[PDB]
Design a binder for this molecule. Sequence first.
Ligand code: HEM
Ligand code: HEM
Ligand SMILES: CCCCCCCCCCCCO[C@@H]1O[C@H](CO)[C@@H](O[C@H]2O[C@H](CO)[C@@H](O)[C@H](O)[C@H]2O)[C@H](O)[C@H]1O
Ligand SMILES: CC1=NC2=C(CCCC2)C(=O)C1c1ccc(Oc2ccc(OC(F)(F)F)cc2)cc1
Lengths: 59, 289, 99, 74, 378
Amino acid sequence: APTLTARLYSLLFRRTSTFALTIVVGALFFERAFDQGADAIYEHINEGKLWKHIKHKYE
Amino acid sequence: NYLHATAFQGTPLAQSVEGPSENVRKLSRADLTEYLSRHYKAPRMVLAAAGGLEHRQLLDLAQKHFSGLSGPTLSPCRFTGSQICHREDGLPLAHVAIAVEGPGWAHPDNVALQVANAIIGHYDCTYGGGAHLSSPLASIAATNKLCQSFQTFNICYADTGLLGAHFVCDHMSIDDMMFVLQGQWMRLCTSATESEVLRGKNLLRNALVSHLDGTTPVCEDIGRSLLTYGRRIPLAEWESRIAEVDARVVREVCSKYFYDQCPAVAGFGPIEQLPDYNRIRSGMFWLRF
Amino acid sequence: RWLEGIRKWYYNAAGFNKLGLMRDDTIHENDDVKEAIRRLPENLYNDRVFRIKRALDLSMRQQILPKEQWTKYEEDKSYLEPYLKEVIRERKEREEWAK
Amino acid sequence: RQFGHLTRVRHVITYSLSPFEQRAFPHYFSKGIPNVLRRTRACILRVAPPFVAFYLVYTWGTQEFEKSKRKNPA
Amino acid sequence: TNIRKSHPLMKIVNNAFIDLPAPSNISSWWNFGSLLGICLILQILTGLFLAMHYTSDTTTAFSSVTHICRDVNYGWIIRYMHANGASMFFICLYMHVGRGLYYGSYTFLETWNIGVILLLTVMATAFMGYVLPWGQMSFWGATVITNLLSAIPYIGTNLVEWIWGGFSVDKATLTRFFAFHFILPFIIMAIAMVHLLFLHETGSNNPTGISSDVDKIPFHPYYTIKDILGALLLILALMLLVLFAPDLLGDPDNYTPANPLNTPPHIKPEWYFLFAYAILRSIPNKLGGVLALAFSILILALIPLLHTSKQRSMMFRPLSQCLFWALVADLLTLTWIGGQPVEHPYITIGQLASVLYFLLILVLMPTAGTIENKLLKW
Ligand code: HEM
Ligand code: HEM
Ligand SMILES: CCCCCCCCCCCCO[C@@H]1O[C@H](CO)[C@@H](O[C@H]2O[C@H](CO)[C@@H](O)[C@H](O)[C@H]2O)[C@H](O)[C@H]1O
Ligand SMILES: CC1=NC2=C(CCCC2)C(=O)C1c1ccc(Oc2ccc(OC(F)(F)F)cc2)cc1
């Protein structure tokens, strides 16, 4: 088997058509991942300070 | 010489045939005789002949005079995507030579690459065709007076080679020549047509059938084929390999060697216009296919 | 004479020598200098061309030459002076004649 | 002025590598750090002295304004 | 032949953007042009989006700006991008000018003088922009600065009231300041294009101040990729302000509405005028102070004439280098002093800094050039 970067090239990055479709798929999966991941980091840093954390007290 | 020197840099293929002046001035007779006995050996040699002769007779003559002949492996050569630019504005025309790494003697792809190189072909200012020339590179080059001359090549060595083109042009045309040439490489890679490949096939069929005319070229074909392939490949076999090539083949074969690959560039003379390597390298792909 | 100490100091402080330039490479090209350059013989011109090419390439990398390779103060020939002097001397004659 | 009409150059060779053949950061710390220190040392006592002077005239003037606003023992 | 060199629109783009011959060796100080362009476009977009929500009526004005920040969707991030974007513009401007001074790019006379005009236009724009929120510093800043023109003999007093469209900075002043502030960036964009049109006559200067025709590289990809990196760093600086300290470069008093009675403690313009504000306060006489404030900017037009050195760049010029960095440090002092109340020791420091500003430009740096020449037997 050739290296992982090489497999990525032959499958995704060689044809500019696949290169662009890769970017659009990747952008979706990155967006959701990054947002969810960064929100977690924020809300942990501000545990119990946010309306989201104290919402339960008045419902 | 520059193309090889940069293409196969840091190897024995970078070396010129004639050697540096330093060596010529210093090589003693001891060096020459040592070189001879090391490399001139019966298994690394072929006696070829063509004309009016009985094969049996040649073989017996070989016995008589070449019996005393005695009885060093080549390392592969690393191709490098590189540029050598000898800028010399004092000279009146610019020479540019560009190539990607070719497959080398043995490889069957060479036949398909020859077909592709025949499509693009060659041109100079004394050619009768002009605008009506079949090669788009040639017709564009002729009508716009881009170059004085150009040829595609495919140079074969043992495990490697130089596949590309050389052109000679006006100092203001180098960028345009490169653009049209690289444009042709891309068009064959992505979108070669059946009829133009048929033309290339027909050129190549005609090329190697009429080159082998008279005894000297035939003798040489025997001599060298035995060294490179280990046999003479008959014309009927060449024809079978050529008929096998269609538009799909030319695309797939060209895309292997040309598409998104780092070339070796050599330029000499008034080369101020000769494109920057990055621009040349970006010219090795299309943003569509 | 006595300020030769300071001239030698300034030379190294200025530091164009570190790029392998001579003083006359650093002259700002006005109309006179252009003409002076234009009048240089093949050898002196191509040296100028290379020295600058070398300096620009070094500047591009934000690097200098090895200290051995630096232009020595004493070895800095004033290569452009004879051409430039005469270009100027000529123009001043035309400017005089015009009055 | 287009490329090919800029100026006259003779007998100057330029060798270079493809960006795919080479590294983006060759000897980035190894040669980078010392070159930075050389660059910094070269310009430091041209660049720094006026900002030293600013810092001093600033911190002098600031606490001079403070002392002046205090009452004097008289 | 290609359709980049052929097509009438692409031709201009190909020559001024892609195949442009650029010196191999241009440094980070050459990024500021591109960044000024980004700033201008950034201001225009953010500005236009703000103008969809703002009103120039004196009663509703302050309210509309706050309505943007509280009720309009992402109106806050737009508003503070625009305010800090104005700061980022002026940072970019002074860095861009500094480059020109140090490397002697000002020898490109037309390019340089168009620059001076651009500077003055961005200044006029940003002065009138700061008035639009109609806070205290807005109103009182506009009042003091405008009213300096009354110091002109015979006409001055009329002139001021004609700008105002009344007897104070009021209803007609705010409305027209909105109209002028809207149109001017577009005038800037035009003049900026003429700016480059003259630059592409000569091509770029470089750090050596020695001609670079022998070693030009095409703009693409080398400087397209650098400019992207620069743009990225500009966005970082901007967003670091916008998202972590949006109030840092402004003033608090511009969060209380404009009151024609109640004067703020230490009335001052925004930071990027402070240097010239300090120069104004140095001279005891008012008309003198105005003519000094005006000459503190216009002197830029005089710089090329003051050039004495036989070398173009300061790269190879130690004495000039120091004097240049002194001039920078002095400007930093004038900015500090501009922000201070008029008292001891800030009056005397201010006087001494203003003396040194004009002394550096008109006497010391010219002398230093000629001393450097005579040290090189020139
Ligand atoms: C909105 C304001 C401005 C914009 C958009 C602008 C734009 C540009 C751009 C894009 C460049 C080329 C890239 C560069 O070298 O930075 C440039 C160069 C230049 N600008 Fe500006 N500029 C502005 C203001 C000014 C000012 C205020 C001055 C001087 C007072 C000035 C003088 C110059 C000079 C001299 C150059 C040539 C630099 C060189 O080749 O070394 N510009 N400008
Ligand atoms: C060189 C370009 C520009 C500069 C330097 C600039 C500068 C400024 C400044 C400093 C403010 C006050 C910001 C604050 O304290 O809130 C402002 C406000 C404003 N600007 Fe601009 N501006 C520019 C272009 C534009 C354009 C093109 C428009 C509209 C098409 C615009 C519309 C506004 C509006 C509506 C306000 C009031 C809202 C606010 O205070 O943020 N500006 N401008
Ligand atoms: C005894 C040792 C002295 C060394 C230390 C110096 C600081 C001690 C204070 C001494 C006085 C300093 O002098 C200080 O200068 C400034 C600026 O000129 C004065 O300011 C005054 O003079 C200037 C003169 O042009 C006028 O334009 C201005 O209208 C006026 O306010 C202060 O009112 C004064 O107090
Ligand atoms: C047009 C340009 N010319 C040059 C250099 C340096 C090197 C040589 C000359 C540049 O960086 C350069 C440039 C200028 C601006 C760039 O982005 C823009 C930003 C704004 C813009 O709009 C406008 F017109 F300026 F208002 C147009 C372009 C990108 C590149």
